PDB file of C-alpha atoms in Angstrom:
ATOM      1  CA  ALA A   1       2.383  20.736   5.698  1.00 47.53           C
ATOM      2  CA  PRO A   2       2.645  16.995   4.695  1.00 48.44           C
ATOM      3  CA  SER A   3       0.461  14.534   7.498  1.00 49.23           C
ATOM      4  CA  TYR A   4       0.296  10.569   7.686  1.00 48.92           C
ATOM      5  CA  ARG A   5      -3.861   9.922   8.880  1.00 51.65           C
ATOM      6  CA  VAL A   6      -5.295   6.821   8.666  1.00 50.98           C
ATOM      7  CA  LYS A   7      -8.444   5.573   7.466  1.00 50.07           C
ATOM      8  CA  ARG A   8     -11.090   2.762   7.764  1.00 53.47           C
ATOM      9  CA  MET A   9     -11.849   2.072   4.938  1.00 53.32           C
ATOM     10  CA  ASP A  10     -12.294   0.594   1.741  1.00 54.80           C
ATOM     11  CA  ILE A  11      -9.301   1.649  -0.143  1.00 57.24           C
ATOM     12  CA  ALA A  12     -11.552   2.067  -3.401  1.00 55.59           C
ATOM     13  CA  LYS A  13     -13.207   5.119  -1.388  1.00 57.30           C
ATOM     14  CA  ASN A  14     -10.274   7.302  -0.907  1.00 59.09           C
ATOM     15  CA  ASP A  15     -10.721  10.569  -1.157  1.00 60.97           C
ATOM     16  CA  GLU A  16      -6.463  11.019  -2.405  1.00 60.62           C
ATOM     17  CA  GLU A  17      -5.122  12.132  -5.878  1.00 58.35           C
ATOM     18  CA  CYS A  18      -3.427   8.505  -6.515  1.00 56.43           C
ATOM     19  CA  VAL A  19      -4.224   4.689  -5.005  1.00 56.31           C
ATOM     20  CA  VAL A  20      -1.716   2.387  -4.103  1.00 54.20           C
ATOM     21  CA  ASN A  21      -3.287  -0.881  -5.144  1.00 57.51           C
ATOM     22  CA  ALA A  22      -1.824  -3.998  -2.994  1.00 59.49           C
ATOM     23  CA  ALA A  23      -1.176  -5.736  -5.745  1.00 59.45           C
ATOM     24  CA  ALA A  24      -1.196  -9.478  -6.179  1.00 57.21           C
ATOM     25  CA  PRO A  25       1.926 -11.034  -8.171  1.00 57.40           C
ATOM     26  CA  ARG A  26       1.529 -11.384 -12.367  1.00 57.20           C
ATOM     27  CA  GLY A  27      -1.162  -8.925 -12.970  1.00 56.15           C
ATOM     28  CA  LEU A  28      -4.441 -11.087 -11.126  1.00 53.47           C
ATOM     29  CA  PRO A  29      -6.953  -9.126  -9.831  1.00 54.26           C
ATOM     30  CA  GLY A  30      -6.282 -10.893  -6.750  1.00 56.62           C
ATOM     31  CA  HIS A  31      -8.599 -10.853  -3.266  1.00 58.11           C
ATOM     32  CA  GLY A  32      -9.374  -8.332  -0.326  1.00 57.52           C
ATOM     33  CA  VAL A  33      -7.625  -4.661  -1.637  1.00 56.76           C
ATOM     34  CA  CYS A  34      -6.186  -6.332  -5.043  1.00 57.81           C
ATOM     35  CA  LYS A  35     -10.358  -7.575  -5.926  1.00 59.11           C
ATOM     36  CA  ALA A  36     -11.782  -3.995  -4.310  1.00 56.88           C
ATOM     37  CA  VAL A  37      -8.919  -2.064  -6.826  1.00 59.63           C
ATOM     38  CA  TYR A  38      -9.792  -4.238  -9.490  1.00 61.58           C
ATOM     39  CA  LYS A  39     -13.869  -3.389  -9.576  1.00 63.21           C
ATOM     40  CA  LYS A  40     -13.871   0.304  -8.326  1.00 66.10           C
ATOM     41  CA  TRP A  41     -10.368   0.500 -11.917  1.00 63.48           C
ATOM     42  CA  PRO A  42     -10.704  -2.357 -14.302  1.00 64.00           C
ATOM     43  CA  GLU A  43      -9.044  -0.656 -16.475  1.00 62.99           C
ATOM     44  CA  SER A  44      -5.788   0.172 -14.285  1.00 64.36           C
ATOM     45  CA  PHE A  45      -5.449  -3.355 -14.851  1.00 62.95           C
ATOM     46  CA  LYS A  46      -3.885  -3.102 -18.574  1.00 63.44           C
ATOM     47  CA  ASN A  47      -0.415  -5.112 -18.885  1.00 59.60           C
ATOM     48  CA  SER A  48       0.105  -4.365 -14.843  1.00 59.75           C
ATOM     49  CA  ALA A  49       1.707  -6.831 -13.395  1.00 57.42           C
ATOM     50  CA  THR A  50       5.365  -6.348 -11.870  1.00 57.42           C
ATOM     51  CA  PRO A  51       7.584  -8.081 -10.733  1.00 55.68           C
ATOM     52  CA  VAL A  52       7.575  -9.315  -6.008  1.00 52.66           C
ATOM     53  CA  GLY A  53       9.733  -5.761  -4.444  1.00 55.85           C
ATOM     54  CA  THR A  54       8.743  -3.561  -7.522  1.00 55.96           C
ATOM     55  CA  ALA A  55       5.748  -1.046  -8.374  1.00 54.98           C
ATOM     56  CA  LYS A  56       3.968  -0.396 -11.734  1.00 53.58           C
ATOM     57  CA  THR A  57       1.544   2.429 -12.177  1.00 53.82           C
ATOM     58  CA  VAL A  58      -1.121   3.118 -14.607  1.00 53.35           C
ATOM     59  CA  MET A  59      -3.497   4.954 -15.424  1.00 51.28           C
ATOM     60  CA  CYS A  60      -7.318   4.586 -14.378  1.00 54.28           C
ATOM     61  CA  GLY A  61      -8.398   7.611 -16.449  1.00 54.23           C
ATOM     62  CA  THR A  62      -6.258  10.060 -15.498  1.00 56.24           C
ATOM     63  CA  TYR A  63      -6.783   8.721 -11.720  1.00 55.26           C
ATOM     64  CA  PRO A  64      -3.300   6.873 -11.476  1.00 57.10           C
ATOM     65  CA  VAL A  65      -3.887   3.662  -9.601  1.00 57.08           C
ATOM     66  CA  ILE A  66       0.756   2.244  -8.194  1.00 59.47           C
ATOM     67  CA  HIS A  67      -0.100  -1.224  -8.803  1.00 59.05           C
ATOM     68  CA  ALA A  68       2.726  -2.557  -5.199  1.00 57.89           C
ATOM     69  CA  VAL A  69       4.005  -6.577  -5.123  1.00 60.59           C
ATOM     70  CA  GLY A  70       4.402  -6.574  -1.573  1.00 59.96           C
ATOM     71  CA  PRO A  71       6.069 -10.590  -1.012  1.00 61.21           C
ATOM     72  CA  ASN A  72       3.863 -13.380  -0.200  1.00 65.84           C
ATOM     73  CA  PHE A  73       5.721 -14.725   3.399  1.00 66.75           C
ATOM     74  CA  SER A  74       4.244 -18.639   2.980  1.00 64.60           C
ATOM     75  CA  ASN A  75       6.901 -18.245  -0.488  1.00 65.48           C
ATOM     76  CA  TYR A  76       9.677 -16.449   1.241  1.00 68.64           C
ATOM     77  CA  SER A  77      11.951 -16.444   3.682  1.00 72.92           C
ATOM     78  CA  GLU A  78      11.607 -13.727   6.537  1.00 69.76           C
ATOM     79  CA  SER A  79      14.821 -12.448   5.259  1.00 70.90           C
ATOM     80  CA  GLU A  80      13.988 -12.210   1.971  1.00 71.86           C
ATOM     81  CA  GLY A  81      10.800 -11.287   2.304  1.00 66.88           C
ATOM     82  CA  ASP A  82      11.992  -8.452   4.482  1.00 66.03           C
ATOM     83  CA  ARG A  83      14.215  -7.224   2.073  1.00 65.33           C
ATOM     84  CA  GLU A  84      11.354  -7.381  -0.679  1.00 65.42           C
ATOM     85  CA  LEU A  85       8.918  -5.644   1.400  1.00 67.78           C
ATOM     86  CA  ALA A  86      10.942  -2.633   2.408  1.00 69.99           C
ATOM     87  CA  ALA A  87      12.418  -2.527  -1.339  1.00 73.15           C
ATOM     88  CA  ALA A  88       7.423  -2.560  -3.231  1.00 75.69           C
ATOM     89  CA  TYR A  89       7.396   0.859  -0.608  1.00 77.27           C
ATOM     90  CA  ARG A  90       9.924   1.984  -2.203  1.00 76.67           C
ATOM     91  CA  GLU A  91       9.114   2.074  -5.527  1.00 74.57           C
ATOM     92  CA  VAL A  92       6.291   3.617  -3.862  1.00 74.98           C
ATOM     93  CA  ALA A  93       7.843   6.793  -2.383  1.00 73.58           C
ATOM     94  CA  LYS A  94       9.120   6.637  -6.076  1.00 71.73           C
ATOM     95  CA  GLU A  95       6.714   6.482  -8.278  1.00 71.98           C
ATOM     96  CA  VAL A  96       4.446   9.065  -5.860  1.00 68.38           C
ATOM     97  CA  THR A  97       7.316  11.292  -6.110  1.00 65.43           C
ATOM     98  CA  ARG A  98       7.877  11.579 -10.404  1.00 66.12           C
ATOM     99  CA  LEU A  99       2.999  11.455 -10.849  1.00 65.76           C
ATOM    100  CA  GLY A 100       3.697  14.888  -8.151  1.00 68.75           C
ATOM    101  CA  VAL A 101       0.446  14.547  -6.444  1.00 67.61           C
ATOM    102  CA  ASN A 102      -0.258  16.304  -3.767  1.00 69.27           C
ATOM    103  CA  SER A 103      -1.692  12.515  -1.448  1.00 73.96           C
ATOM    104  CA  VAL A 104      -1.909   8.990  -1.241  1.00 73.03           C
ATOM    105  CA  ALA A 105      -3.856   6.416  -0.033  1.00 72.96           C
ATOM    106  CA  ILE A 106      -1.726   3.939   0.727  1.00 74.09           C
ATOM    107  CA  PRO A 107      -2.185   0.240   1.864  1.00 74.98           C
ATOM    108  CA  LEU A 108      -0.271  -1.751   4.421  1.00 76.37           C
ATOM    109  CA  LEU A 109       1.806  -4.411   2.051  1.00 75.76           C
ATOM    110  CA  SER A 110       2.220  -8.239   2.678  1.00 75.11           C
ATOM    111  CA  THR A 111      -0.495  -8.260   5.291  1.00 74.31           C
ATOM    112  CA  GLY A 112      -3.565 -10.774   6.082  1.00 75.30           C
ATOM    113  CA  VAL A 113      -3.144 -13.435   2.201  1.00 72.27           C
ATOM    114  CA  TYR A 114       0.433 -12.727   1.697  1.00 70.44           C
ATOM    115  CA  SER A 115       0.887 -12.376   5.953  1.00 71.88           C
ATOM    116  CA  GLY A 116       3.013 -15.784   6.155  1.00 70.23           C
ATOM    117  CA  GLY A 117       0.076 -16.409   9.446  1.00 70.64           C
ATOM    118  CA  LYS A 118       1.539 -14.132  11.186  1.00 70.18           C
ATOM    119  CA  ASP A 119       1.314 -10.308  12.585  1.00 70.41           C
ATOM    120  CA  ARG A 120       2.801  -7.859  10.895  1.00 71.29           C
ATOM    121  CA  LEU A 121       1.888  -4.508  11.629  1.00 73.75           C
ATOM    122  CA  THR A 122       4.352  -2.999  12.802  1.00 76.31           C
ATOM    123  CA  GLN A 123       7.023  -4.731  10.440  1.00 80.80           C
ATOM    124  CA  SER A 124       5.219  -2.967   7.009  1.00 81.07           C
ATOM    125  CA  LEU A 125       3.612  -0.039   8.842  1.00 85.14           C
ATOM    126  CA  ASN A 126       7.640   0.836   9.370  1.00 84.27           C
ATOM    127  CA  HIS A 127       8.478   0.223   6.022  1.00 85.81           C
ATOM    128  CA  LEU A 128       5.448   2.517   5.090  1.00 86.65           C
ATOM    129  CA  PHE A 129       7.207   5.109   7.146  1.00 85.32           C
ATOM    130  CA  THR A 130      10.837   5.077   6.282  1.00 84.09           C
ATOM    131  CA  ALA A 131       9.753   4.825   2.559  1.00 80.48           C
ATOM    132  CA  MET A 132       7.422   7.478   2.039  1.00 83.39           C
ATOM    133  CA  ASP A 133       9.103   9.632   4.886  1.00 82.06           C
ATOM    134  CA  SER A 134      10.925  10.113   2.339  1.00 84.31           C
ATOM    135  CA  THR A 135       8.679  12.842   0.038  1.00 81.70           C
ATOM    136  CA  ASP A 136       6.148  15.716   0.249  1.00 83.41           C
ATOM    137  CA  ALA A 137       2.734  13.648   0.023  1.00 85.25           C
ATOM    138  CA  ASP A 138       0.372  14.027   2.422  1.00 87.09           C
ATOM    139  CA  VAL A 139      -0.211   9.916   3.086  1.00 87.00           C
ATOM    140  CA  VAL A 140      -3.664   8.921   4.693  1.00 87.21           C
ATOM    141  CA  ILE A 141      -3.527   4.607   5.692  1.00 85.91           C
ATOM    142  CA  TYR A 142      -6.136   2.318   5.208  1.00 87.54           C
ATOM    143  CA  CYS A 143      -7.016  -0.546   7.153  1.00 86.94           C
ATOM    144  CA  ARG A 144     -10.250  -2.484   8.141  1.00 87.94           C
ATOM    145  CA  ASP A 145      -8.982  -4.004  11.242  1.00 92.01           C
ATOM    146  CA  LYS A 146     -10.623  -2.269  14.290  1.00 92.39           C
ATOM    147  CA  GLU A 147      -7.953  -2.702  16.783  1.00 93.80           C
ATOM    148  CA  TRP A 148      -4.941  -2.427  13.769  1.00 96.14           C
ATOM    149  CA  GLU A 149      -6.885   0.883  13.359  1.00 92.32           C
ATOM    150  CA  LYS A 150      -5.793   2.114  16.839  1.00 94.27           C
ATOM    151  CA  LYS A 151      -2.531   0.826  17.283  1.00 94.75           C
ATOM    152  CA  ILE A 152      -1.564   2.400  13.444  1.00 92.94           C
ATOM    153  CA  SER A 153      -2.826   5.720  15.041  1.00 91.70           C
ATOM    154  CA  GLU A 154      -1.056   5.235  17.585  1.00 91.48           C
ATOM    155  CA  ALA A 155       2.196   4.757  15.343  1.00 91.54           C
ATOM    156  CA  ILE A 156       1.401   7.975  13.602  1.00 91.43           C
ATOM    157  CA  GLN A 157       1.437  10.235  16.652  1.00 88.89           C
ATOM    158  CA  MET A 158       3.956   9.237  18.428  1.00 87.99           C
ATOM    159  CA  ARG A 159       6.191  10.672  15.724  1.00 91.47           C
ATOM    160  CA  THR A 160       4.668  14.039  15.025  1.00 89.39           C
TER     161      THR A 160
END
């Protein structure tokens, strides 16, 4: 039965059937998660650029990389940013369904450098749940911060 889990580790080392990239705009290698994805699955960046609020899947071999471009809250208002963040996750759920995969590795979109200097764990996680609750896939959320793992883990347990 479909679950949610959280792991504090590099998503480029995930054990799931596909990976969501916290993609930088313009198809660029970016920083953080995006850069790790670029180093592990560079061929997935061929023609990967996609607008803020959307997702685009490129295969690396037969492994799907879902490039999801969340808004950068240094450039978006809070209301417009929230709408595009919600929409990016929606498009992730649509791609996961289309691919038919049994599991997916996801990072929290629009946190870190695309956060507008704000803690957006809860905002981004709740959009993740809303979108992925609509799918059948096992979801494994990948973070790096130890306090975030705790908070994510608590949220996962509050809905079981």
